[PDB]
Ligand binder design. Structure first.
Ligand SMILES: Nc1nc2c(ncn2[C@@H]2O[C@H](COP(=O)(O)OP(=O)(O)OP(=O)(O)O)[C@@H](O)[C@H]2O)c(=O)[nH]1
Ligand SMILES: Nc1ncnc2c1ncn2[C@@H]1O[C@H](COP(=O)(O)OP(=O)(O)CP(=O)(O)O)[C@@H](O)[C@H]1O
Ligand SMILES: Nc1nc2c(ncn2[C@@H]2O[C@H](COP(=O)(O)OP(=O)(O)O)[C@@H](O)[C@H]2O)c(=O)[nH]1
Ligand SMILES: c1csc(CNCc2ccncc2)c1
Ligand SMILES: [Ca+2]
Ligand SMILES: [Ca+2]
Ligand SMILES: [Ca+2]
Ligand SMILES: [Mg+2]
Ligand SMILES: [Mg+2]
Ligand SMILES: [Mg+2]
Lengths: 423, 438, 54, 322
C-alpha cells in the first residue's frame, strides 16, 4: 500500500497526464467508467499505487487536474477516459497564465494554489503510506511551469520527507509556442534543481525528431508527441505498478540513481519505435534502447558519461539473454560509464508488456550529457536577457531582474556541476 | 537443554529464515500446523530440537524466532504462507516503510522508533527459556534494514544479554542479484558497528550461491527461492549440532571456541558438498573422500577466494549421512598429501569432525537432489580477507567522490562515521595480513 | 594421524583428528547516538522550513 | 571487441603485446583502474588477485600466476627445492644452497658451515657465492668468514650456494656463459618452451655478448661433436617441467573464478661435463632485442587469443605432462 499522488498542471501537463492514465488504465484493465475488466491478477496486485477504490469495485485515479483556464480540462472531462477522474479533483481558474511564469507562480497562480493543496491534502489522507508525488507539466508555458513549481514548493513545506518526481517537458525553438519559453524554462529549472528528487527531462525537440525521422511522420502534432510521452511514462512506472522480483519504491530508486542531490535530471528512452508486426529480438531492443534516436532528451549520450542507468524490460523473453545484452552494451562502451560507481547499470524485467507489443524496453539514464540541454536553454535565455527583451511581461507582475540573474547563475552552475563529473 | 532464539532482520533475513524453518520442520517431522507426532512429551520436554522449538499445551511446536522488517510485504508472505500456523502474531514485526537501502535510515531514523518494540518481543521469547544460549541473526549487508537496524539490534542485544553468544548469517552483496549501488557503504558501515558485538559470523556471498545454482543445479537464471533453499542447507548443517543429539558444536559458545581464536577475525569460510541437480536422470553417490576433497574446491565455497594462498587457523568438518570415522580420516590423509593447506604456526594442524547419521533433508519439489551423505567445512582462512578487499575497494571508489554520501548525512549521520568505519576495515584487513603473510 | 575424543550416540558421532601439533556502548551512550542523529535531522529540516518560509 | 588494462608501463614484453593487441583492431585499452576488462597486464608487486573474476558476464585473464613467487624468489626457490618431495634435497641439477638470515634479524647458518668444513678438510674446491633478491650485491669467496660477514653487513635474506668452479668455456676466448630460456604457461597450464634462447657470454677469459642457439649449437658440433638438443636442451626441458609441475597444484587456475598465464625466464649454467645447472627463475623476464617480435606474438597467440579468440609450425615446444 505505497500510494502515489499524481498532479497534472497546465495545457501540456494535462494533455500528457490524460494520455498517461488512458494507457495505464488499459494495462490495468480499467474501463472509462472505472470498472475492472482484466484477466490477470497482476493487473490488481499493485493497482492501489495509482488508483483509489470506491464502492462497487470502482477504481478512481489518484490524480489532481490543475489549470488556470478551463479549456484543456474541459477536453479531458470530455475525452475518452474523462469520466474516470474524480469530479472534485478538477481545480481550475478562469484568468489563464498567458504563458507567463510570473503569473503562474506569483499572481494568478497564488490565488488558486491553496485550493489545489486542499485536494492534495484530501488524497494524501486516504493513503495507507504515501510514497510521494509525481507532476506532469511543461516548463515553457505559464501554469505548468510557474504554478507547477509553486505547487512543488508548497507541497515540500507540508510533505518534506516524501518523494517528489516530475515529468517535465523542456521547450525547444523547433516546437515553440512563444518566444518567452527560455525565460519560463530557466525560472522553472531553478525551482526543480532545489525541490525535486527525480525529474524526467522530456525534450520536445527530441520527440519531434523521433516522429519525423524515425516514425516517418510528415507533420507531427502534439498528439503524436504525446503518444511517445505516454509510452515512456508507462515504461518508467512499470516497476511500480506490477509485481516482480523488484520491490522498487520511489525512495529506493532515488537513493540508487542520484549520487549528488542537484544532479537528479534523467534522460528517458524507449524501444521499439517502429514506423510493425515483426518480432523485435532482445539484441534489437538493447541496441535501440541505447541509441540516441530512441532517447527523449535530445542529448547525445556520447557527449557525456552515465552516472547511473536503469533499464526495464517488459514481456516474456530470455532473462539470460537480457543479462547477456546489457553486460555486452556496458563492456562494449565502458568509456561512457563513470568507473567510480561500481555496477551503475541495473536491469529489471516484467512479464506484462504494453498493449500491442510482444516486448519493449524503457531506458532511464542519469547522464552528464543532459548538460547540453541546459546549455541550449541558457543560450536562448541569455540572448534575450542581455537586451532585457520581453522582460516587461514579468516586471509587470512584480518580478525584479535580480531574480532572472539568479535563476541563470544556478543553471550555469548546474551545467558546470555536470562538466566536472564528466571528467 | 539451552535455547537458541533466531532473529531475521530485513528481506533477506526473513526469506532465508523462512527457508530454514521450512527445512527445520521437515528435518524434525513438524507439520505446518505445529504438530509433531514423534514428540511423546506433550506441552513440554527438553529434547535437542526444543532448543529451536517451544511447546504449547495443545501440542504445537512454535519456533524460537523473531522476524523483523521495516516494511510489511515480505513478512506478510509468512503470515499467509504455508507455515502461517507455526508463529503467533507477536513473532512477526513489520513497520510501514523501509530504509530504502540507506544504512543511516535503518539505524537512526527508523531504527530508533522500533528498537524497543523488537527488544520487547525478544524478551518474550527469552522469558520462555531456562538457559538461553544466544542469538542467531540473519540479515543482508546491502539492505538498509539488514545493515542499519541489525547493527543497532546487536548493540542493544549486548546490553540486555551481555553473557549471551551472538552469531551472524550475513548475505554479502553481489551485483548479479541486486539492483542497488550503495551496498558497499552499508556493508562497511554495518560491519564497523557490529564487529565488537558478533562472536561468529558466516558470510555467504550471493555471487557464490548464484554460480553454484547455475553450475550444479543448471538454473540459467537463479531466483531468490533457489538461493534460499541452498543457503538453508548450509545453515541447517551449521545449526544441526544445536538441534540434534551430538557432541561437536553443542552450544553457540563452541562455535567461537573452535572457529575463532582472535575476536576480530570471526568470519569462517563455509564450504558445502555435494550440490546435485534433482532434474538429473540419477547421480552417482559421492564418497566420503570425494565430498571431503570437494571442500577444497573454490567452486563450492560460500565466498569465492583462494585458501591455497592464505593460512588456516581452525577447521571443522560437519558430516551428514552415511559417514563413518574410518572413511573421514582416510580422506583427510589423502587431501593433506595433495592440497595446499598452510596452517598458522600458533595453531594445531587438525580438524574437529562431527557426524550426524540423518542425511540431508531436501524440500520436495525443490532443486536439490536427495544425497546419501554431505559435508560442510567451516575453516577460518585469511583468504576470506579477499572479500573485505573487494568490498573496501568499491567503497573507496565512491567515497573519493562522496557519491551518495548526502543520502546518509540527510538521515542524521555524520560524514565522519564513513571514514571511521573505513579505517576500521583497513585495520581488519591489516589483522588478516599479519596472521597469514610472512 | 591421531584420533581423539570419539563420541558415539544413536544419531551420529563426533571426533577429532590431529595431523601435526602446533609450533561496549552502554544503554545510555546508545540513546545519545540516536538522539544526536535525530537532532541533526531536526536542524536540517528547520533550515529547510526557514528557507521555505523566506 | 575485447578490453585490456596496462598496469606495468615498464614491461618491455607486454608493452609489445599491448602494442600488438591494439594493432588487431579487436582489442581496446582501458584506463588502468577500469575493472570492466578482459585481460590484465598487471603490476609486478602487489597485483590484486582478490579483485579478479568478480565482474558479472566478464571472463577475466591476468599475465601472472598468484604464487609463482615461490619459484622466482631466491630464498623461496631454495626452500621449495629442499622441502618438496617432487624435488627432494638430493636434486641433482640445483647447486647446493642454504638460506642464511643476517644476524640482525628458518636459518641454515650451522648447516651451511658443516658442509663447508667437509670440503675444506677434504681438499675439495670450497668456493661459494652469496646473493639475495634485493640486488641490482654479490660476493664470491672461498673463505666462509667473508661470506657470512658480508650478509650481516646487509639487512635482507641471503642464500649461499656452491659456485660452479668448472664452467664450460667457449673457444676461442676461454670465456664463461649462461643460458636464458623463456617459458610460457597458459591458463590450461600447458608448459610451452620458446624455440629460441640466448647465451650471455662473458667477454673476458675465465655481438653484444649474446649468442643464440643456432650459433651455440654449431659450436657444440665442431668443438664437442654433439648437439644443443642432446647435450643441454634435454636437461633444460627436464628442469623446467620439474619446477613448474611441482607448484602446479598451488598456482593452477583451472577451477578458479579467473584465469592466469605467465612468462618465465629460466637461467641455466653449463659445466665442462655438459651437465646443466639451475641458477634462478625470473618471473618478470625481459627478451632479447632480436626476439621480441616472435615471442611477443607467440604470447598473444597461445596465451591471450586462446581465451579471447579473434575473427605454423609453433614457435613453442610443448612440454607435455600429467
Ligand atoms: N541470498 C539472498 N539474498 C537476498 C535475498 N533478498 C535480498 N537479498 C540481497 O539483499 C540485498 C538487498 O537488501 P535487502 O535485504 O533486500 O534490504 P532490507 O533488509 O529489506 O532493507 P531495506 O533497504 O529497508 O529494504 C541485495 O544484495 C540482495 O541480493 C534473499 O532472499 N536471499
Ligand atoms: N653458483 C654459481 N656458480 C657459477 N656461476 C654463478 C653461480 N651463481 C651465479 N652465477 C653467475 O651469475 C649469473 C647469474 O646471476 P644472478 O641471476 O644471481 O643475478 P641476477 O638475477 O640479477 C641476473 P638475471 O636474474 O637476469 O639472470 C650467471 O651468469 C652465472 O654465471
Ligand atoms: N509534448 C507536448 N508539449 C506541449 C503540449 N502542449 C504544450 N506543449 C509545450 O509546452 C509549452 C507551452 O506550455 P503550456 O503547457 O501550453 O503552458 P500552460 O498551459 O500555461 O502550462 C511549449 O513548449 C509547448 O511546445 C503537448 O500536448 N505535448
Ligand atoms: C527523500 C528524502 S528527503 C527528500 C527530499 N524531498 C524534497 C521534496 C520536494 C518537493 N515536495 C516534496 C519533497 C526525498
Ligand atoms: Ca484575481
Ligand atoms: Ca516434547
Ligand atoms: Ca558481546
Ligand atoms: Mg499553451
Ligand atoms: Mg526490504
Ligand atoms: Mg633476478
Amino acid at each position: 500500500m505505497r500510494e502515489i499522488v499524481h498532479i497534472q498542471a497546465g495545457q501540456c501537463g494535462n494533455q500528457i497526464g490524460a494520455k498517461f492514465w488512458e494507457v495505464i488504465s488499459d494495462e490495468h484493465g480499467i474501463d472509462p467508467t472505472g470498472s475492472y475488466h482484466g484477466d490477470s491478477d497482476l493487473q490488481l496486485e499493485r493497482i492501489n499505487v495509482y488508483y483509489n477504490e470506491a464502492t462497487g469495485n470502482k477504481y478512481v485515479p489518484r490524480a489532481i487536474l490543475v489549470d488556470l483556464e478551463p479549456g484543456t480540462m474541459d477536453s479531458v472531462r470530455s475525452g475518452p477516459f474523462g469520466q474516470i477522474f474524480r469530479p472534485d479533483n478538477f481545480v481550475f481558474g478562469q484568468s489563464g497564465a498567458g504563458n507567463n511564469w510570473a503569473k503562474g507562480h506569483y499572481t494568478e497562480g497564488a490565488e488558486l494554489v491553496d485550493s489545489v493543496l486542499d485536494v492534495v491534502r484530501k488524497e494524501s489522507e486516504s493513503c495507507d503510506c504515501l510514497q510521494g508525488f509525481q507532476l506532469t507539466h511543461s516548463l515553457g508555458g505559464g501554469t505548468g511551469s510557474g504554478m507547477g513549481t509553486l505547487l512543488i514548493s508548497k507541497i515540500r513545506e507540508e510533505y518534506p520527507d516524501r518523494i517528489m518526481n516530475t515529468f517535465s517537458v523542456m521547450p525547444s525553438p523547433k516546437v515553440s509556442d512563444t518566444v518567452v519559453e527560455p525565460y519560463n524554462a530557466t525560472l522553472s529549472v531553478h525551482q526543480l534543481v532545489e525541490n525535486t528528487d527525480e525529474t524526467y527531462c522530456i525534450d520536445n525537440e527530441a520527440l519531434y525528431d523521433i516522429c519525423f525521422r524515425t516514425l516517418k511522420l510528415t507533420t507531427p502534432t502534439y498528439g503524436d508527441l504525446n503518444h511517445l510521452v505516454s509510452a515512456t511514462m508507462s515504461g518508467v512506472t512499470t516497476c511500480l505498478r506490477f509485481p516482480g522480483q523488484l520491490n522498487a519504491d520511489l525512495r529506493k530508486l532515488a537513493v540508487n540513481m542520484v549520487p549528488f542531490p542537484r544532479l537528479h535530471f534523467f534522460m528517458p528512452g524507449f524501444a521499439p519505435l517502429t514506423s510493425q508486426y515483426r518480432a523485435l529480438t532482445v539484441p534489437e531492443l538493447t541496441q535501440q534502447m541505447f541509441d540516441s534516436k530512441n532517447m527523449m532528451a535530445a542529448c547525445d549520450p556520447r557527449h557525456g558519461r552515465y552516472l547511473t542507468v536503469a533499464a526495464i524490460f517488459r514481456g516474456r523473453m530470455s532473462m539470460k539473454e537480457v543479462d547477456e545484452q546489457m553486460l555486452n552494451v556496458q563492456n562494449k562502451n565502458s568509456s561512457y560509464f563513470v568507473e567510480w560507481i561500481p555496477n551503475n547499470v541495473k536491469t529489471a524485467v516484467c512479464d506484462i508488456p504494453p498493449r500491442g507489443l510482444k516486448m519493449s524496453a524503457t531506458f532511464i539514464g542519469n547522464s552528464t550529457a543532459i548538460q547540453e540541454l541546459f546549455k541550449r536553454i541558457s543560450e536562448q535565455f541569455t540572448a534575450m536577457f542581455r537586451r532585457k527583451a520581453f522582460l516587461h511581461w514579468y516586471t509587470g507582475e512584480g518580478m525584479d531582474e535580480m531574480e532572472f540573474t539568479e535563476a541563470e547563475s544556478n543553471m550555469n552552475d548546474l551545467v558546470s556541476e555536470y562538466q566536472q563529473y564528466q571528467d | 537443554m539451552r535455547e537458541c532464539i533466531s532473529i531475521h532482520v530485513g528481506q533477506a533475513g526473513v526469506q532465508i529464515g523462512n527457508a530454514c524453518w521450512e527445512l527445520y520442520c521437515l528435518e524434525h517431522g513438524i507439520q505446518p500446523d505445529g504438530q509433531m507426532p514423534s514428540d511423546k512429551t506433550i506441552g513440554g520436554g527438553d529434547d535437542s530440537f526444543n532448543t529451536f522449538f517451544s511447546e504449547t499445551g495443545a501440542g504445537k511446536h512454535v519456533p524460537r524466532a523473531v522476524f523483523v522488517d521495516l516494511e510489511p510485504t515480505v513478512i506478510d508472505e509468512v503470515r499467509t504462507g504455508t507455515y502461517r500456523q507455526l508463529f503467533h502474531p507477536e513473532q512477526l514485526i513489520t513497520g510501514k516503510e523501509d530504509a530504502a537501502n540507506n544504512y543511516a535510515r535503518g539505524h537512526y531514523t527508523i531504527g530508533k522508533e522500533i528498537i524497543d518494540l523488537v527488544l520487547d518481543r525478544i524478551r518474550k521469547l527469552a522469558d520462555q527459556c531456562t538457559g538461553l544460549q544466544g542469538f542467531l541473526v540473519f540479515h543482508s549487508f546491502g539492505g538498509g534494514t539488514g545493515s542499519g537496524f541489525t547493527s543497532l539490534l546487536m548493540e542493544r542485544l549486548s546490553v540486555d544479554y551481555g553473557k549471551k553468544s551472538k552469531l551472524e548469517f550475513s548475505i554479502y552483496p553481489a551485483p548479479q542479484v541486486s539492483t542497488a549501488v550503495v551496498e558497499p557503504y552499508n556493508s562497511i558501515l554495518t560491519t564497523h558497528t557490529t564487529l565488537e558485538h558478533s562472536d561468529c559470523a558466516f558470510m555467504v556471498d550471493n555471487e557464490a550461491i548464484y554460480d553454484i545454482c547455475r553450475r550444479n543445479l543448471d538454473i540459467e537464471r537463479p531466483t531468490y527461492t533457489n538461493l534460499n533453499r541452498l543457503i538453508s542447507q548450509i545453515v541447517s548443517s551449521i545449526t544441526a549440532s544445536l538441534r540434534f543429539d551430538g557432541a561437536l558444536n553443542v552450544d553457540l559458545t563452541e562455535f567461537q571456541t573452535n572457529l575463532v581464536p582472535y575476536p576480530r577475525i570471526h568470519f569462517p569460510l563455509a564450504t558445502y558438498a555435494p550440490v546435485i541437480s534433482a532434474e538429473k536422470a540419477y547421480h552417482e553417490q559421492l564418497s566420503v573422500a570425494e565430498i571431503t576433497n570437494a571442500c577444497f574446491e573454490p567452486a563450492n565455497q560460500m565466498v569465492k577466494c583462494d585458501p591455497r594462498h592464505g593460512k588456516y587457523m581452525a577447521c571443522c568438518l560437519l558430516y551428514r549421512g552415511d559417514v563413518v570415522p574410518k572413511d573421514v580420516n582416510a580422506a583427510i590423509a589423502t587431501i593433506k598429501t595433495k592440497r595446499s593447506i598452510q596452517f598458522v604456526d600458533w595453531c594445531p594442524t587438525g580438524f574437529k569432525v562431527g557426524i550426524n547419521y540423518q542425511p540431508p533433508t531436501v524440500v520436495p519439489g525443490g532443486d536439490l537432489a536427495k544425497v546419501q551423505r554431505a559435508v560442510c567445512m567451516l575453516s577460518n582462512t585469511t583468504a576470506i580477507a579477499e572479500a573485505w578487499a573487494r568490498l573496501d575497494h568499491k567503497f573507496d571508489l565512491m567515497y573519493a567522490k562522496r557519491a551518495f554520501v548526502h543520502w546518509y548525512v540527510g538521515e542524521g549521520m555524520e560524514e565522519g562515521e564513513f571514514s571511521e568505519a573505513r579505517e576500521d576495515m583497513a585495520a581488519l584487513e591489516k589483522d588478516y595480513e599479519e596472521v597469514g603473510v610472512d | 594421524m591421531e584420533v581423539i575424543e570419539l563420541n558415539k550416540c544413536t544419531s551420529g558421532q563426533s571426533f577429532e583428528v590431529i595431523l601435526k601439533p602446533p609450533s561496549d556502548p552502554s544503554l545510555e551512550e546508545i540513546q545519545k547516538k540516536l538522539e544526536a542523529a535525530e537532532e541533526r535531522r531536526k536542524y536540517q529540516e528547520a533550515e529547510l522550513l526557514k528557507h521555505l518560509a523566506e | 571487441m575485447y578490453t585490456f588494462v596496462v598496469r606495468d608501463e615498464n614491461s618491455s614484453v607486454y608493452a609489445e603485446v599491448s602494442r600488438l593487441l591494439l594493432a588487431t583492431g579487436q582489442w581496446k585499452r582501458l584506463r588502468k583502474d577500469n575493472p570492466r576488462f578482459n585481460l590484465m597486464l598487471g603490476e609486478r608487486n602487489r597485483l590484486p588477485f582478490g579483485r579478479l573474476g568478480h565482474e558479472p558476464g566478464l571472463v577475466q585473464l591476468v599475465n601472472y600466476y598468484r604464487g609463482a613467487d615461490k619459484l622466482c624468489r631466491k630464498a623461496s626457490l631454495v626452500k621449495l627445492i629442499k622441502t618438496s618431495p617432487e624435488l627432494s634435497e638430493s636434486c641433482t641439477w640445483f647447486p647446493e644452497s642454504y638460506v642464511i638470515y643476517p644476524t640482525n634479524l628458518t636459518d641454515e647458518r650451522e648447516v651451511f658451515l658443516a658442509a663447508y668444513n667437509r670440503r675444506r678438510e677434504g681438499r675439495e674446491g670450497n668456493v661459494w657465492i652469496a646473493k639475495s633478491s634485493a640486488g641490482a650485491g654479490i660476493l664470491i669467496s672461498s673463505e666462509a668468514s667473508e661470506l657470512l660477514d658480508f650478509i650481516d653487513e646487509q639487512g635482507q635474506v641471503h642464500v649461499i650456494q656452491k659456485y660452479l668452479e668448472k664452467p664450460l668455456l667457449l673457444e676461442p676466448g676461454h670465456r664463461k656463459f649462461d643460458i636464458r630460456s623463456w617459458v610460457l604457461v597458459d591458463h590450461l597450464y600447458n608448459i610451452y618452451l620458446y624455440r629460441e634462447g640466448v647465451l650471455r657470454t662473458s667477454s673476458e677469459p675465465y655481438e653484444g655478448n649474446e649468442m643464440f642457439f643456432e650459433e651455440f649449437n654449431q659450436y657444440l658440433m665442431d668443438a664437442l661433436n654433439t648437439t644443443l638438443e642432446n647435450s643441454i636442451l634435454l636437461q633444460i626441458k627436464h628442469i623446467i617441467r620439474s619446477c613448474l609441475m611441482c607448484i602446479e597444484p598451488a598456482i593452477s587456475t583451472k577451477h578458479l573464478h579467473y584465469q592466469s598465464f605467465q612468462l618465465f625466464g629460466f637461467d641455466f649454467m653449463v659445466d665442462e661435463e655438459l651437465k646443466v645447472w639451475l641458477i634462478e627463475v625470473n618471473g618478470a623476464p625481459a627478451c632479447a632485442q632480436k626476439l621480441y617480435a616472435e615471442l611477443c606474438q607467440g604470447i598473444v597467440d597461445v596465451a591471450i587469443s586462446s581465451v579471447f579468440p579473434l575473427a605454423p609450425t609453433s614457435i613453442f615446444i610443448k612440454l607435455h605432462h600429467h
